[PDB]
RNA sequence: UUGACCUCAAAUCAGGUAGGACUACGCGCUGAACAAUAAGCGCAGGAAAAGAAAAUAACCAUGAUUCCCUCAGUAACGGUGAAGCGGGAAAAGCUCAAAUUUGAAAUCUGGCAACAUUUCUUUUGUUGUCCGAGUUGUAAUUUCAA
RNA sequence: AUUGGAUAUGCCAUAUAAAGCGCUUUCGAAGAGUCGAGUUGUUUGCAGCUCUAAAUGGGUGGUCAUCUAA
RNA sequence: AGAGCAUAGCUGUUGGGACCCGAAAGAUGGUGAACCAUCUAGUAGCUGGUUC
RNA sequence: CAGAAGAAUCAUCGAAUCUUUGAACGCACUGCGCCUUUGGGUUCUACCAAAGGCAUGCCUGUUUGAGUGUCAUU
């Protein structure tokens, strides 16, 4: 079998139309969730900083965001990752704190019974 | 502004953090109730034919043959050593009671 | 005939920028415009720039 | 060529033609009305987010960005408090203005007491005063529901207002 | 609870109590059909942890297979064919002897309203779960085809991928 | 004895459901010749499968799955031939078993009677009542990240 | 004409309720004819057969790290 | 006191059906020793041919 | 060709209809039936015709009856 790439420009267009389709549904919030900053796990790459999967629970507790609130305002949680050093904790705590500064959370209507 | 700069570096300074113990790492720890349940069941269920034979050899002080039979049945040494210790205490508790 | 014949061909991006630069330069020569079949014999000037 | 496709070629029946091919047209915006009004339909979502002053991605972009015109320490990270951010556009100000005003409208968080709740807390207060909540919770006769001091404190607070 | 005692008693399978019950019930099961309905599971601890609830729409079936492919996989498939209107949830080992291995298969009725209104077993109603045991989607079926995570467990290497610009 | 329970059957009893076809892609089982090969058999969907670590690593550590690029025609093996990292597309997490609701099976199907509702007089529910299921365990609560 | 997610607003709301966070002189259950051992076949995985477990235990890695299967 | 890297073309070479036509098949599955379908474009050092 | 004057050998299409078979289902595979209901008819108890039905496995329930069952049972 020989795989051909004639749909390469048609996949590019289809993926872009999905981003536009996604943005139409969720109008003002970002098309991606904020990702942490981590360091790759080798002696070849540990100097580089890249994006992680989600923020650790210890990073969210320091930033002031609970693990149940976090998912609702676009902050992924990684229950697996941990902070073995204070630099990873502070690098990503500041990342969450900056995110909260630039964030507008629209209020939600709440059911409110008469008494009690 | 929210933005991640990928590549280069962020800082070579290091400060090791002490991490707590995760709940999954607690697995295998014996419970006060599980130890009670097993003691009740072990007496109620009885003993396997190979455990009866192994118990006979320990009663006759033929521990060399007992350990060999347990390993031949169970498969490894540390499984045989654990079974012999478990059955030896059963004999000791039986002797104290009877 | 097979569909996986090489249909597209790569060019270094710097050669492509060279060719487009050389083709823009050629469009400022009235003689090259005439020799390519353009009826520019009454055009006031080359390059021909108009108001915004 | 297929027997099924040849069958409808040999028939007199028309095809179930559906004219849906519309490329280069982008999805129309719903959800937020403020974004919909200020959203142009020709520009991309990156161009519209930037024009409206929002961020499409809180991370890096995995490619180039268009250039249309030539350009002319844990204490201070944990105890710090970032001073929010200014609104670069009138749309972002419009979004921010709506959020604060609506939150102010929906701010009545304190709750009143029902007939049972009021009579419950009132009877406890008449015997143990208003400051001793620990002995209030330990009275089995009047505190039948066995509410602790913190629940009884919140009952009294809601009764005050 | 009593499922702690039941599940620790199920580890001593050749003890006096378990051996007598293994041989008594193995004779009883041989007098019955090859595949017969079970009024209640013979291992209420093991069925309970495999997804069984004592409610309408949950069915337990016993089946004996000859010893000497996976024995548990064939029990799931044979019972699934016998009860074609049910979905095979899971299965387990109940008994064995010198000739037969006895298994109990948990099936779920995708048409009963007590199943279709229960969000925790609502997933089995979808058509993508038609004959899960037939496509190796059960617990033993997944294990049979070496599905798992780790180094302990084709088409994308026998093909030439020719790009547009190459 | 009456009578409960467990069985074992019966009914042209009520309500359901399975078969066959397609099979490009998909998931199982089976299998020669010149290789999970064609065939043969079994089973799905609009995708399927996989999937929230009994996973990598040995680092300043990573973090479900899937696909693409790279690693790499490399290690290893005996010409076959990966994977970790790395770069992208997409991102979403969760549910049970194992706890005494024990100051109250708090749970559920069905019959019947009303009241609604509809892609729809064709659909889908609500409320009430009775019966059944269920204590050999149905709800709430908990899933190790706790 | 049929619909979807929002907005605004009227009515109803079984809240004596239900949650997140915080703190501890109190507790914290974790899946077995499986894991594993021997051996025989299919293509390490899987399968049969004989045997058959444990509780800081068990798995996979380099005393340590990581994971938490059935 | 580094000359490489990329693309295009030419030529040679090694794989794929591999210049074309050529050698009994064998295997799988069917139909009534035979017949049929596919694997198959199976295997060729050899035969014939190979265009201004 | 012919044919109708909301015509059309039209389009759309939400309502009706859709012969015998075929997974094909009363048994068979031409025929032979079973039960029930309805009706005929100048031949009325019946007969006849037609209609309604009548496959199997399995799930939930309903009803009924057996048991060599467990008891209950002064």
Short mmCIF file of C-alpha atoms in Angstrom, two decimals, chain D residues 7-141:
data_model
loop_
_atom_site.label_atom_id
_atom_site.label_comp_id
_atom_site.label_asym_id
_atom_site.label_seq_id
_atom_site.Cartn_x
_atom_site.Cartn_y
_atom_site.Cartn_z
CA UNK D 7 -29.23 1.89 -11.59
CA UNK D 8 -29.90 5.57 -10.88
CA UNK D 9 -28.15 6.50 -14.13
CA UNK D 10 -30.57 4.27 -16.07
CA UNK D 11 -33.60 5.50 -14.11
CA UNK D 12 -35.74 8.51 -14.89
CA UNK D 13 -35.80 9.51 -11.24
CA UNK D 14 -33.67 12.55 -10.33
CA UNK D 15 -30.78 12.40 -7.90
CA UNK D 16 -31.15 13.51 -4.29
CA UNK D 17 -28.98 16.51 -5.12
CA UNK D 18 -28.06 18.64 -2.11
CA UNK D 19 -26.37 21.97 -2.84
CA UNK D 20 -24.22 22.38 0.27
CA UNK D 21 -20.79 23.25 -1.20
CA UNK D 22 -19.83 26.60 0.36
CA UNK D 23 -16.10 26.97 0.93
CA UNK D 24 -14.19 30.07 2.09
CA UNK D 25 -17.25 31.11 4.14
CA UNK D 26 -16.60 31.02 7.86
CA UNK D 27 -18.92 29.97 10.66
CA UNK D 28 -21.22 32.68 11.96
CA UNK D 29 -20.88 33.63 15.61
CA UNK D 30 -23.42 32.87 18.32
CA UNK D 31 -23.06 32.57 22.06
CA UNK D 32 -21.93 36.06 23.02
CA UNK D 33 -23.96 38.88 21.48
CA UNK D 34 -21.23 41.49 22.06
CA UNK D 35 -18.73 39.44 20.06
CA UNK D 36 -21.30 38.79 17.32
CA UNK D 37 -22.02 42.48 16.75
CA UNK D 38 -18.34 43.44 16.47
CA UNK D 39 -17.27 40.31 14.55
CA UNK D 40 -16.61 40.83 10.86
CA UNK D 41 -17.33 37.86 8.62
CA UNK D 42 -14.37 38.09 6.24
CA UNK D 43 -11.43 38.06 8.64
CA UNK D 44 -10.11 34.91 10.27
CA UNK D 45 -10.70 34.13 13.93
CA UNK D 46 -7.15 35.18 14.77
CA UNK D 47 -7.67 38.52 13.02
CA UNK D 48 -11.02 39.06 14.75
CA UNK D 49 -9.78 38.11 18.22
CA UNK D 50 -6.83 40.48 17.86
CA UNK D 51 -9.05 43.28 16.55
CA UNK D 52 -11.47 42.86 19.47
CA UNK D 53 -8.58 42.82 21.93
CA UNK D 54 -8.98 39.21 23.07
CA UNK D 55 -6.54 36.30 23.13
CA UNK D 56 -7.26 33.35 20.86
CA UNK D 57 -4.54 31.26 22.49
CA UNK D 58 -3.04 31.69 25.98
CA UNK D 59 0.01 29.79 24.68
CA UNK D 60 2.49 30.08 21.83
CA UNK D 61 1.52 29.94 18.15
CA UNK D 62 3.07 27.04 16.24
CA UNK D 63 4.06 28.99 13.15
CA UNK D 64 4.68 32.43 11.79
CA UNK D 65 2.37 35.40 12.27
CA UNK D 66 1.32 37.63 9.40
CA UNK D 67 3.21 40.91 8.98
CA UNK D 68 1.17 43.30 6.86
CA UNK D 69 3.09 46.54 7.45
CA UNK D 70 6.70 47.26 8.41
CA UNK D 71 7.14 48.06 12.07
CA UNK D 72 8.19 51.69 12.73
CA UNK D 73 12.12 34.28 44.18
CA UNK D 74 9.12 32.40 45.59
CA UNK D 75 8.01 35.14 48.00
CA UNK D 76 7.45 37.69 45.23
CA UNK D 77 5.62 35.10 43.11
CA UNK D 78 3.33 33.71 45.86
CA UNK D 79 2.51 36.75 48.02
CA UNK D 80 2.21 39.05 44.99
CA UNK D 81 -1.08 40.34 43.58
CA UNK D 82 -1.28 41.23 39.89
CA UNK D 83 -3.27 44.41 39.24
CA UNK D 84 -5.62 42.84 36.67
CA UNK D 85 -5.17 44.28 33.17
CA UNK D 86 -6.44 47.23 31.11
CA UNK D 87 -8.97 46.87 28.32
CA UNK D 88 -7.31 47.65 24.99
CA UNK D 89 -10.58 47.84 23.05
CA UNK D 90 -14.07 49.23 23.52
CA UNK D 91 -15.37 45.68 23.07
CA UNK D 92 -13.35 44.41 26.03
CA UNK D 93 -14.56 47.40 28.06
CA UNK D 94 -18.11 46.55 26.98
CA UNK D 95 -17.58 42.94 28.08
CA UNK D 96 -16.06 44.05 31.39
CA UNK D 97 -18.80 46.62 32.01
CA UNK D 98 -21.51 43.98 31.56
CA UNK D 99 -19.82 41.48 33.88
CA UNK D 100 -19.51 43.87 36.84
CA UNK D 101 -23.01 45.32 36.48
CA UNK D 102 -24.61 41.88 36.15
CA UNK D 103 -22.65 40.54 39.12
CA UNK D 104 -23.85 43.52 41.16
CA UNK D 105 -27.45 42.71 40.20
CA UNK D 106 -26.96 39.06 41.22
CA UNK D 107 -25.34 39.70 44.59
CA UNK D 108 -28.09 38.94 47.15
CA UNK D 109 -26.28 35.97 48.68
CA UNK D 110 -27.60 36.23 52.24
CA UNK D 111 -30.65 34.08 52.89
CA UNK D 112 -33.74 34.55 55.08
CA UNK D 113 -35.16 31.93 57.43
CA UNK D 114 -38.27 29.82 56.93
CA UNK D 115 -40.96 29.25 59.55
CA UNK D 116 -39.22 26.15 60.92
CA UNK D 117 -35.72 27.62 60.69
CA UNK D 118 -36.71 30.78 62.55
CA UNK D 119 -38.59 28.96 65.32
CA UNK D 120 -35.70 26.52 65.64
CA UNK D 121 -32.98 29.09 66.13
CA UNK D 122 -35.21 31.42 68.17
CA UNK D 123 -35.90 28.75 70.79
CA UNK D 124 -32.19 27.98 71.14
CA UNK D 125 -31.33 31.65 71.66
CA UNK D 126 -34.02 32.26 74.29
CA UNK D 127 -32.36 29.69 76.59
CA UNK D 128 -28.62 30.01 75.86
CA UNK D 129 -28.39 33.67 74.89
CA UNK D 130 -26.62 34.75 71.72
CA UNK D 131 -22.90 34.18 72.40
CA UNK D 132 -22.63 30.62 73.78
CA UNK D 133 -23.06 28.50 70.67
CA UNK D 134 -21.03 25.54 71.94
CA UNK D 135 -23.51 24.87 74.74
CA UNK D 136 -26.27 25.62 72.22
CA UNK D 137 -25.24 22.64 70.09
CA UNK D 138 -24.91 20.29 73.08
CA UNK D 139 -28.56 20.67 74.18
CA UNK D 140 -30.22 17.56 72.76
CA UNK D 141 -33.76 18.63 73.70
#
